[PDB]
Design a protein around this ligand. Structure first.
Ligand SMILES: *[C@@H]1O[C@H](CO)[C@@H](O)[C@H](O)[C@H]1NC(C)=O
Ligand SMILES: *[C@@H]1O[C@H](CO)[C@@H](O)[C@H](O)[C@H]1NC(C)=O
Ligand SMILES: *[C@@H]1O[C@H](CO)[C@@H](O)[C@H](O)[C@H]1NC(C)=O
Lengths: 14, 183, 179, 182, 188, 15, 187, 183, 14, 185, 183, 13
């Protein structure tokens, strides 16, 4: 199957 | 600590301000599986066995790295522009196989405890700089959130040929030279 | 030395007893300071330094970011592990054994180029297993999915270096007598 | 992180549970100035120049270590009895002066990345254990809040192979590092 | 594997330009994670990990503890530095320089000369190689500064040479404990 | 050679 | 003298700056006249002499023969170069230098021969020095002699008149040498 | 014409009519790497380092050589039976190392501008034909589509013995002799 | 590894 | 046009190779004629025009006023450079590169490299893969005044066949040079 | 004269009799860092990056400008009341970004060679003067002790809108108009 | 720190 990775989370920033 | 039979890193994301350079790679038991060429939108696997039985969408790397560039501008803003602390890298040179004067071999230069991940690893054979037969790995992650890089040098052991590994890092005061020669 | 600002994210999976006991720990690292992390045993985002509460508490309020990450233990860790079982954990590389010295006693048995890491090397004088005087180096990672280890040992006698490895059906035995 | 011309550690305090072990030492530019023998109530300076022109009240060390014993019993209650994580030490052996196969020298065994601060560093000459002419330093602090220890061995270089034997909980077997005259 | 619980405390002083720019940072460390610290630049006790708020908020409430800690910048850092200025910062140890080849003396086969500059203090030192008074800017392999731990240092500067005839190689060592540079020669 | 001093340690609130 | 008919084929690879600039040229040669050739820069088989159109146009009509030939830039040139990179291109043999006159007499003009006889690869520099003064005139050097057994040889001569304390030296530079080899000769 | 750092010839295959005879060899920078003995079906490498760590299937040589014989009957028919022109060879004899009466050495006889590739290269010591210590290279290719061959003779330099290189070719009227003696 | 080389092309003959 | 009397003072710092080579020159200017100046390289106040001897020698007579000015090499020049090192000397703005023309008739292709900082930049034109050494009309570096720059590089060419012209831009704010393409027809 | 990698103007002090108008500004590499509003006692930084990491006491500006008024009354007496010479300004108008209809842009009007520092720079859109979306910089210093000013106008490129820059200076006889329109 | 600079000199008037 197609391998994938962990999704990163967005920070509050601006 | 976390004891486990196998430790995998499905998402070693890295983005810095200097380059501005980044890297997306996966690792399994400390070895690099692949790295995504962010300039070409290409997944470059680090093994012939991986290139035949695995597939990974390179678009997920550019999406994930783009979030790092976003997250970077906030922790620098939140930490009042706290720069990185230059660490002194540790260099060690050894051969891949037992050395038999005439039998082709490969020299290995491990540069441990790299931070920040900006370094030149170049080879020197009898004074002159080597340009052919040199390949290196990406930045492999460490448990203390530092990095280490490994550069290779295919050579032919001879009675009169001495090799060197030239490492240039900001944590160093002068370019560090590590020597190796067949006794 | 120009200043540099480093940001890292490492979604690490810990496997034990196969694909059963799986632990997911995502770490958000600024330079070298990890400020926020998600733990599958905890279930939510936890702050590690004062640089993290503003981000961990915001990520716990949203259900689309906390539910997508809690499910990542199954869609990332256990999903990729099924491909490791057919490629990485099946990789067998046979070790190359070489014995050579560096009135004293120092014999270097160089076991090079092997994978995986599980390996047992034993020294034998004639047929006496040397339980004392064995100086072994830690497992050296060449970086190309191969390893290397050097086991040292400190009157006609035949010393042999026995190497056992999953990539070998029969043990490799290399001898070396003093001329 | 903190750039400075000189970095001093006026109060390297250490207290652990595994036995009544403690340590109070001062450090300047990475070198150990002194250490207080907590059992003997004695300030032991590490240089002949220091023993003659400097003074430090050893009682202030016992005061500070006694607070560590109290503060240790406090963080154990807050951390729900979280024990220490055994680190893998890195051993390195080198000589103090160039080897001349007859001129007295001193072997140095640096044991880096020590944690917890419980270790045995013993010497070996041709297999047999050496007991005389061996001295070691206290636990010198590192930036990552771990420790490293250095053991010394005054010896006579002869055409004799020496070993440094390190015993730590983070290791599975006693680690031996080799050194021999070129 | 027996369990161990470690607690450490590090009252560190940072000096720059003498006692002009001095900074005090006390670190309260549990096992290996520093959980609470005081910073003279900040002025109050700060929590570093969630293990610290119950300790940082209690140490800031007491006014005898915040005044005693701010004064430690003057009663510990600047007080001891005046004592370092007459003992430690005046310590000068002259380096012992020695040249010797690694491989045995060859007629023309390549060899490498090791210039061992051993036992010197302080750490500032500069070593240069000279073949017939020509400074060798290439082929010089220098090791990092080795900290012996007994208030001495040592550094080994190697040269990748080829032994011809006449060849007079010299190792030039400059050190603050030396008014004139120390030079050791080596002829083929 | 005056009397040297160092790190004053802070006590934590525990029973 | 019996008549002879010769046919040749030369699959030559041209490398520049490593494997970055690689060019493949296969040459179909009849006797001494090359009549048809393939060029990777051109992309198809080209006729060079009137003896070639009947063969070049036929080899371009079949798509499996030009596609197998165009692909040889990777399976022959670039494939073998990875094996040359660890064997041939690593071969370094340092030269053995020997000085001897071509008849030894003082105040009588002679010729000093600096014999550089066993070195590989071909890059080499020889310089003559009389009393550490480089002789830029009177140096008769022979072209690079190919021994044929993966070694080279070059003979550099110097026109001089032997004196009392004149010391002639021969400086040899070669990639297999970190420092130049110097051989002296006293009268 | 074509400037390059290195020029390799991976397939110097040759087929002739007289009588019949062929040769398959590889070359790198003008030196012979190996040659396939078409009668023995054996790859004979020309260097000790090559013989131990390199491999080439000799069957691909015999497969390709059959194509030259096939293509030869095509150009012979199309060129209306145009025979080869015998070229005059250039002979030169020199030693591999400086000669010092008593120290073993090797004589080298270079025969340049050879065409067609049919020649007899024999040595002569004091008139008599030499039979021991004689080895030669194959036909090395030239840019002008001619060939050159090099014959070797390991000998013991003596004040006696005057050695000769005897070349027999169709382009010559009589066997050409090149003389060599220790000065 | 196994080296390779110039595959010759066959001409239409007879 | 009413008469005007202008007086100026310019405390200028000159930095080279970082904080190593620093030179301070304060300029006392009347209208447009600079009449008195202090130089850190010289060390004292110098009169430059006949309007200055009464002012340069009065400022050299005061020893605390000449000492306050000599110390400004450290309290003004070298003091502010540490503040430029964290804001100005780190400011990197990536250039927005755009290719647009101004058929067999000759025309002009304009590679607009706009909004970039700092000033160091190199722009090169490429026809297929041959660097254009002729026909490159470049404007001088334009200072927008809001801490951004812009430069317009034009190419005098003929759009024939099927050639792809590219504009390669190098700037410190770039890991890789920015390349924008433009194909004929 | 004085070549340097970076040239900063830490103290562009200016005082004239006409207003009586003055200005205190700092400059780095030709760009204005800030200017002190002498009436409001406010340091007005010209960049978002400057407002977050920099601070400047406005009182040092008012102190220094007050000395200019003192020093000015002497050089008028010493030079026998030599007034300023009105210089002819050079006006140039250009856009900040390439012009695309409908996509917002910004016009820039450069007024070079200004002396004395008294000028009116107003914008005109199809004749009537525009007041919204207009901001300008202070008097930037030049090496020849004159000044130049830059006025900005954020606008929306349209087919039926032609803009003008109107400069009024004493060195000119009539208001100078420079034209700009989307070609 | 607090930025500053350009100290002006007073003339005899
Ligand atoms: C070494 O790396 C630096 C950046 O850290 C770079 O500027 C320099 O060009 C590199 N040197 C070489 C020889 O590649
Ligand atoms: C500290 O630096 C200042 C200026 O750099 C200098 O005047 C002083 O002598 C230095 N040392 C001190 C204050 O002890
Ligand atoms: C500039 O405007 C003022 C009034 O705002 C006016 O008095 C002056 O004459 C104008 N300048 C010129 C050169 O006309």
């Amino acid at each position: 199957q197609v391998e994938l990775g962990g999704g990163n989370a967005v920070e509050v920033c601006k | 600590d976390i004891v486990a039979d196998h430790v995998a890193s499905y998402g070693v994301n890295l983005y810095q301000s200097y380059g501005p350079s980044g890297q997306y790679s996966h690792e399994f038991d400390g070895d690099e599986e692949f790295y995504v060429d962010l300039e070409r939108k290409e997944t470059v696997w680090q093994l012939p066995l991986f290139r035949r039985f695995r597939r990974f969408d390179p678009q997920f790397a550019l999406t994930n790295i783009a979030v790092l560039k976003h997250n970077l501008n906030c922790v620098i803003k939140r930490s009042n522009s706290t720069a990185a602390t230059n660490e002194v890298p540790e260099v060690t040179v050894f051969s891949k196989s037992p050395v038999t004067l005439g039998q082709p071999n490969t020299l290995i230069c491990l540069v441990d405890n790299i931070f920040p991940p900006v370094v030149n690893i170049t080879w020197l054979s009898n004074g002159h700089s080597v340009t052919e037969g040199v390949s290196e790995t990406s930045f492999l992650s460490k448990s203390d959130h530092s990095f280490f890089k490994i550069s290779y040098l295919t050579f032919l052991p001879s009675a009169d040929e001495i090799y060197d590994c030239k490492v240039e890092h900001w944590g160093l005061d002068e370019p560090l030279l590590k020597h190796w020669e067949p006794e | 030395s120009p200043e540099d600002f480093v940001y890292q994210f490492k979604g690490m999976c810990y496997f034990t007893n196969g694909t059963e006991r799986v632990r997911l720990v995502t770490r958000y690292i600024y330079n070298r300071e990890e400020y926020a992390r998600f733990d599958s045993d905890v279930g939510v985002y936890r702050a590690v330094t004062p640089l993290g509460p503003p981000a961990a508490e915001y990520w716990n309020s949203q259900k689309e970011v906390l539910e997508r990450t809690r499910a990542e233990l199954d869609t990332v860790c256990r999903h990729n592990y099924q491909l490791e079982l057919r490629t990485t954990l099946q990789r067998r590389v046979e070790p190359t054994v070489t014995i050579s010295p560096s009135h004293h006693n120092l014999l270097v048995c160089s076991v090079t180029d092997f994978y995986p890491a599980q390996i047992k090397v034993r020294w034998f004088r004639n047929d006496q297993e040397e339980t004392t005087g064995v100086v072994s180096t830690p497992l050296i990672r060449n970086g190309d999915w191969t390893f290397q280890i050097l086991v040292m040992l400190e009157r006609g006698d035949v010393y042999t270096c026995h190497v056992e490895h999953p990539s070998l059906q029969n043990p490799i035995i290399v001898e070396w007598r003093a001329q």
